[PDB]
């Protein structure tokens, strides 16, 4: 839903990473969201028993 | 062909305050809800402008 | 007729800019106006407690 | 025995896409590098591509 001015092509967040990008053929604004997210933990009773 | 419009060389110029004027976009990237620090040849606030 | 023009001069300075939700620049701070403006420029907040 | 933290959940890319502007013409390689007369060093020429 971001509305880029005609002279702008890329968008950057506070960490300077690219967040919004204009498609050079359809002239529509698209957002880039990372693919990795969420924590993972493993519960083991000890490898010498199971 | 130009015929001199005025004989008076100069008049004493008087200055006003440029309250918070002359701010230009430093780069062509889009930022939302961002407080951004940039160094460039800006016009000083509350300056003397002829 | 009746026309007035104004001329000012630029200078190397550091600015802190407020960017709006729609991408417009709504406010900015001169970091060398006074100590209060300098502390706003360093603290990255338009309100100083 | 215990609970251990591991790496965060990763999702691997599945495709690769390229998005370039719709451009058809070829750049003037034959009138920049192949010109009949070049400019002098003191009055060099500048061209837009
Ligand atoms: C590159 O190709 C795309 C897709 O073929 C062009 O998109 C067209 O844009 C016009 C402008 O309104 C539409 O009327 C067409 O319907 C679009 N095409 C399709 C297939 O929907 C795009 O314009 C091309 N790039 C340039 C610079 O012309
Ligand atoms: C630069 O101009 C020269 C002409 O002096 C080109 O040389 C000719 O190129 C054509 C096309 O490949 C050949 O059929 C001719 O045999 C070439 N002439 C000679 C004498 O060999 C050259 O191709 C041009 N280069 C570019 C990049 O446009
Ligand atoms: C754990 O396994 C090792 C090797 O299999 C064994 O020597 C040790 O006694 C085991 N610990 C317990 C508490 O059974
Ligand atoms: C006025 O214009 C005339 C036109 O030739 C010029 O000769 C003259 O020097 C001018 N007066 C000035 C510059 O004071
Ligand atoms: C501009 O300079 C004049 C003196 O030339 C001074 O009286 C005036 O206060 C100055 N304006 C400011 C500091 O805003």
From Swiss-Prot, chain D:
Residue span of region Disordered: 10-26
Mutation effect (residue 37 to T): In strain: Omicron/BQ.1.1, Omicron/XBB.1.5, Omicron/EG.5.1
Phenotypic consequence of residue 30 to D: In strain: Omicron/BA.1, Omicron/BA.2, Omicron/BA.2.12.1, Omicron/BA.4, Omicron/BA.5, Omicron/BQ.1.1
Effect of residue 30 to H: In strain: Omicron/BA.2.75, Omicron/XBB.1.5, Omicron/EG.5.1
Residues modified by glycosylation: 14, 16, 22, 34
Entry function: Attaches the virion to the cell membrane by interacting with host receptor, initiating the infection. The major receptor is host ACE2. When S2/S2' has been cleaved, binding to the receptor triggers direct fusion at the cell membrane. When S2/S2' has not been cleaved, binding to the receptor results in internalization of the virus by endocytosis using host TFRC and GRM2 and leading to fusion of the virion membrane with the host endosomal membrane. Alternatively, may use NRP1/NRP2 and integrin as entry receptors.
Subunit structure: Binds to host ACE2. RBD also interacts with the N-linked glycan on 'Asn-90' of ACE2. Cleavage of S generates a polybasic C-terminal sequence on S1 that binds to host Neuropilin-1 (NRP1) and Neuropilin-2 (NRP2) receptors. Interacts with host integrin alpha-5/beta-1 (ITGA5:ITGB1) and with ACE2 in complex with integrin alpha-5/beta-1 (ITGA5:ITGB1). May interact via cytoplasmic c-terminus with M protein. May interact (via N-terminus) with host bilirubin and biliverdin, thereby preventing antibody binding to the SARS-CoV-2 spike NTD via an allosteric mechanism.
Name of the protein: Spike protein S1
Species annotation: Severe acute respiratory syndrome coronavirus 2 (2019-nCoV)
Residues of the full protein shown: 310 to 358 of 1273
